[PDB]
Amino acid sequence: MTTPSHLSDRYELGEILGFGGMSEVHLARDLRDHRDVAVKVLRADLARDPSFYLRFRREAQNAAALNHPAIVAVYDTGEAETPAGPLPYIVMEYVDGVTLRDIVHTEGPMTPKRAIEVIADACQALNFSHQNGIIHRDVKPANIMISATNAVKVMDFGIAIGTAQYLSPEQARGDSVDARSDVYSLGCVLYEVLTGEPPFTGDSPVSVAYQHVREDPIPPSARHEGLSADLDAVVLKALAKNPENRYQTAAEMRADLVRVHNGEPPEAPKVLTD
Ligand SMILES: Nc1ncnc2c1ncn2[C@@H]1O[C@H](COP(=O)(O)OP(=O)(O)OP(O)(O)=S)[C@@H](O)[C@H]1O
Secondary structure (H helix, E strand, O other), rough: OOOOOOOOOOEEEEEEEEEEOOOEEEEEOOOOOOOEEEEEEOOOHHHOOOHHHHHHHHHHHHHHOOOOOOOEEEEEEEEEOOOOOEEEEEEEEEEOEEEEHHHHHHHHOOOOHHHHHHHHHHHHHHHHHHOOOOEEEEHHHHHHHEOOOOOOEEOOOOOOOHHHHHHOHHOOOOOOOOOOHHHHHHHHHHHHHHOOOOOOOOOOHHHHHHHHHHOOHHHHHHHOOOOOOHHHHHHHHOOOHHHHHOOOOOHHHHHHHHHOOOOOOOOOOOOOOO
């Protein structure tokens, strides 16, 4: 039962842009500051459920505020009073565009050069985040948008619904996560934009986590054609089980992708098929 037409006598809501497991996101006009913004509101249909309300206040509303061209900026948080009860929200940079989850669904895999470019920009966002002490912690296709003018925008950093499909082996065992955990999860995203499939699927979330821990990904070139062995090398280094065997920074990952984009050999160890 509905999201109001206005929040805090300031954000006039327009069209709905999207939804997830917790939120509905609306295009709005900020009447104070004269800005188009995206307002993430607790889903109307879940808003009275204690567990979702409390998760929204703890998680979504505590998205990190970072200032980088490839990071969706966070402007504000608040809570509206409705006759149904409190409706919490977070106000952020409006991206006119779609998520990688959307793109992979509607178009299937990207050309390898596009995929490289997109993930290379995503590396720049993560490296900025990491230099400001913030680990993303939920790198996944739904958290990366491409704009109408083809800019890459990463969102929802630093938060403690959603899928084991992208978690690092260390998150699968509830351990310490660092920059290399972000690298692995971006590795998963890269695999999916290249092949159309994530590295691991399963009947359950505990089944996919098991595969992250114990099972080698099928090399990208085996799952989809037109993908070089140099691309296998970079993807499978990012996807290494031991953090010490992965790219140690997002910058180091980007550098290998830049080599491959330029037709240079990557520094990652060779992977042999067939
Ligand atoms: N800043 C943004 N600008 C434009 N659209 C956005 C923006 N952020 C989110 N969206 C759209 O709204 C959708 C839902 O946002 P999500 O962050 O995935 O939802 P959520 O419910 O808070 O997250 P989980 O991960 O599902 S619990 C996205 O898939 C986009 O379609």
